[PDB]
C-alpha cells in the first residue's frame, strides 16, 4: 500500500526513515544511502535538501529527531501538507 508523499508517513515513520539514513554509513551501502537521501529530498521538498541531514543549522538538535522537528515546523509555516496525524 505504498507511500509516495510525505503525508503518507506518520511522524514516527518518517523519523525512522531518517534514522535509517544515519545508519547507512557503511561503504557497502552507498547506493541505498544516496537513494534514500534523494527520496528524502523529494518528500520534504525542503530547500536545504541533504544539508538538513549532513550540515544542520546549529541551534537545533543534530539528530534525526531535530531533523523531523525542523521539517514539521517548516512545512507548517509554508502552508504545505504535514505528516499523517497520530497514526
Amino acid at each position: 500500500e505504498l507511500k509516495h508523499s510525505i503525508s503518507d508517513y506518520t511522524e514516527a515513520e518518517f523519523l525512522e526513515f531518517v534514522k535509517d539514513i544515519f545508519r547507512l554509513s557503511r561503504p557497502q551501502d552507498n547506493d541505498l544511502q544516496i537513494k534514500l537521501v534523494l527520496e528524502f529530498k523529494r518528500l520534504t521538498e525542503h530547500p536545504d535538501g541533504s544539508d538538513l541531514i549532513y550540515y544542520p543549522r546549529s541551534d537545533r538538535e543534530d539528530s534525526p529527531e531535530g531533523i523531523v522537528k525542523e521539517i514539521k515546523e517548516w512545512r507548517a509555516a509554508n502552508g504545505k501538507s504535514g505528516f499523517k496525524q497520530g497514526l
Binding site: P27, Y55, S63
Partner: protein, 126 residues
Amino acid sequence: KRNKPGKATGKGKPVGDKWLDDAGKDSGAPIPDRIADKLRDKEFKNFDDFRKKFWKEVAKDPDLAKQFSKANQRNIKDGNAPFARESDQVGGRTTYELHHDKPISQDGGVYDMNNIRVTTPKRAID
C-alpha cells in the same frame, strides 16, 4: 594505478579547526600530518583501501571528527567518505574525495600523502 597494492609515504601538513572548510576551497586540503603519522609505513591493498582507512583515522582524531555533523561522523567511523554540502556537490558526486596533486611518476606514488588532497566534488576539477 589505484588498483595495485603498496605502502603509504610522506608527512602531510599541520591542520586546525578549519581543515574541512579548506577542502571546499582551491586545491582542497592536505592530509593532516597526525593522520599521515598513523598511515605512513602501512601496506594498502589498493587506493580504495587507503581511503577507507584514511576516513577511519579522521574519525579517531577528535579535532577532525568534531568538524563533521553526527551523520557524517558515522560515515567516517565506517570508512565511508562524508557527504558534501549541496552547494559543493556536482550532480552525481556527493562526497568528499581524495585526489593527487602531481602526476604519479614512481612506484607507490599513488600513496604519497604529500601529494593527496581532500576536496569537495566541486574542487576536484581543480
